[PDB]
Amino acid sequence: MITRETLKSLPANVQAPPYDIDGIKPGIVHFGVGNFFRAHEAFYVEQILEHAPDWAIVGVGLTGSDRSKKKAEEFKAQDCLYSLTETAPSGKSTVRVMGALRDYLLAPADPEAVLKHLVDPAIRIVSMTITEGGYNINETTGAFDLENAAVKADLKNPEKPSTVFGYVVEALRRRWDAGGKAFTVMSCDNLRHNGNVARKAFLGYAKARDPELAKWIEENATFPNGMVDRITPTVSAEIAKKLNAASGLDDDLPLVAEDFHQWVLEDQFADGRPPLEKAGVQMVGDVTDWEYVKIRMLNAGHVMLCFPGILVGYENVDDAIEDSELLGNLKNYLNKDVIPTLKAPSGMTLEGYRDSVISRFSNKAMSDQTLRIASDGCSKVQVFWTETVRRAIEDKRDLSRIAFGIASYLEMLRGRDEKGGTYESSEPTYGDAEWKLAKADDFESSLKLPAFDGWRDLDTSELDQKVIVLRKIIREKGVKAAIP
């Protein structure tokens, strides 16, 4: 059956919004209505709407392309309702019709319409998922780019903007001038200290617009940082058909996500917020510790699994996590090297986190390619492994497993698995010089790759020697033979 406000007589297997859809009112405006938002932010709000019905979400798309209009039409056609299938590693899935998103507006169609929502006193939070590039931070200067075409145009006619920066700042100006209150700017993009990024972008535009205005926003608005997870894959036509065939719903906008989900959010709101804790959102004073748990256990674990997995010849993460030796090595790395040198946030155990990392990697429906996980391996090693290596060296702890990860990465770079297959991993930051080292036939040259610069200031003598010893074993007897 098609999805509609009236046709909410879904099959016994499909759950419906757990609240009166007619009783909820808008409290959040969201920029960038993508899959992640619909399966994460919208997901948590859906669970507190029965408690505080004034937090419905008004979605806004920034592009007015021919494809954008179609999407907006499909949403309105289903009363903005859509189905979300949640699949667990056990293979079992559940499906529900989400009602938190009460309107979907195409900004270009009517700029004033968006601004009206933005200035409404009931709208106390403005969230967004616009990707990193969406924040318009120049990669070289690290500052908000005032040279951007759309930004300059907005600066010329700020009363009728087209960029998120223009809409948000103009809305804040009007609220201020009319005696209203500032709202909370809540980034839900997966970036380190996403709130600080948002603050830089929005205040960067505000400053150019009017110093006094930026001062006001800086003092009254808030830009909390949040850590967000939840794998929510792209939805292809073929994927949509499987989801609908399984749910029994003729959904034009079906999506699926892993059952696992997490949201750590700094409790810094300008004018109130939903009771998100009731939905499992973890409110904190500083997001930093949680970001590092994810970085040093989930991300670090992902590559500790995939680098040697590629050498064994595994194409997907779920195939590698099923390998008894690679799994044991991952657990030993997390238990012996990371957990003992990782600060633990309150209200959770690092061991429980470890268990979730393992379980998630075993979710066949979510499984990604090992080579994809290994792409830009240099930057990943720098960000995910450096702290763990520095601590092991500084505190004089066992380097065996740490060296194995490095040796595996270096051997993986050579481009050949133990089954005879060849491959070419992607390393954007590497040039001819780097790749020459990576492919050298010796076992010492590639130790100079930039991937290991994060701990090069320390005495890496013992670590490097062990790495060499393991690379030798890996090349002659295979990767598993080198596992500590």
Residue numbers in the entry: 1 to 484
From the manuscript:
In this study, we heterologously expressed and fully characterized a recombinant polyol-specific long-chain GoSLDH. Based on the conserved catalytic motif (KXXXXHXXH) in polyol-specific long-chain dehydrogenase, GoSLDH can be grouped into the subfamily of polyol-specific long-chain dehydrogenases. The observed results suggested that GoSLDH is highly specific towards D-sorbitol, mannitol, and D-arabinitol. Measurement of activity with D-sorbitol as a substrate suggested that GoSLDH is exclusively an NADP+-dependent enzyme, resulting in only 2.5% relative activity with NAD+.
The identified GoSLDH had 32–82% sequence identity with polyol-specific long-chain dehydrogenase family enzymes. Further, the catalytic region of Pseudomonas fluorescens MDH (PfMDH) was identified as the previously suggested conserved sequence (KXXXXNXXH) of polyol-specific long-chain dehydrogenase. This GoSLDH alignment (Q9KWR5) revealed the presence of three highly conserved residues, Lys294, Asn299, and His302, that have been found in other known polyol-specific long-chain dehydrogenases. In addition, GoSLDH possessed the active site residues of Asp190, Val228, Lys294, and Asp299. The structure of GoSLDH and PfMDH bound with D-sorbitol lacked sufficient detail to reveal precisely how it bound. To understand the binding conformation of D-sorbitol along with GoSLDH and PfMDH, molecular docking was performed. D-Sorbitol formed strong interactions of five hydrogen bonds with GoSLDH, with Asn190, Lys294, and Leu191 playing the roles of interacting amino acids. In addition to the hydrogen bonding network, the amino acids Met227, Val287, Ile295, and Phe384 showed hydrophobic bonding with the D-sorbitol in GoSLDH. The distance between Lys294 and the O2 hydrogen atom of D-sorbitol was 2.35 Å, which favors close contact. Given the shorter distance between Lys294 and the O2 hydrogen of the substrate, it seems that GoSLDH could abstract a proton more efficiently than PfMDH. Further, the high activity of GoSLDH was analyzed in a structural analysis together with CV and ITC studies. These observations suggested that recombinant GoSLDH is more catalytically efficient than other SLDH or MDH due to the close proximity of D-sorbitol to the catalytic residue, along with high binding affinity.
